[PDB]
């Protein structure tokens, strides 16, 4: 029962604190911004089984 109301309505209730590579105040980079961006852009769309 993950009722994905946020993607249904288009609201952004908590996707902003979800990862380190998101939009940050005053564009502050996380210390592992590139590594997390590489892992997310790798694992995007292929599911958990193919992503592991």
């Amino acid at each position: 029962p993950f009722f994905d109301v946020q993607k249904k309505l288009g609201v952004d209730l908590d996707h902003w604190m979800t990862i380190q590579s998101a939009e940050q105040p005053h564009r502050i980079p996380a210390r592992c911004h590139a590594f997390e961006k590489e892992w997310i852009e790798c694992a995007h769309g292929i599911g958990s089984i193919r992503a592991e």
């Binding site: 604190m17 380190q20 940050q24 105040p25 502050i28 980079p29 996380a30 210390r31 592992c32």
Partner: peptide, 11 residues
């Protein structure tokens, strides 16, 4: 603080 993960400072 170690990760410099800015938005989770309010967590």
């Amino acid at each position: 603080l170690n990760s410099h993960f800015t938005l989770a400072s309010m967590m």
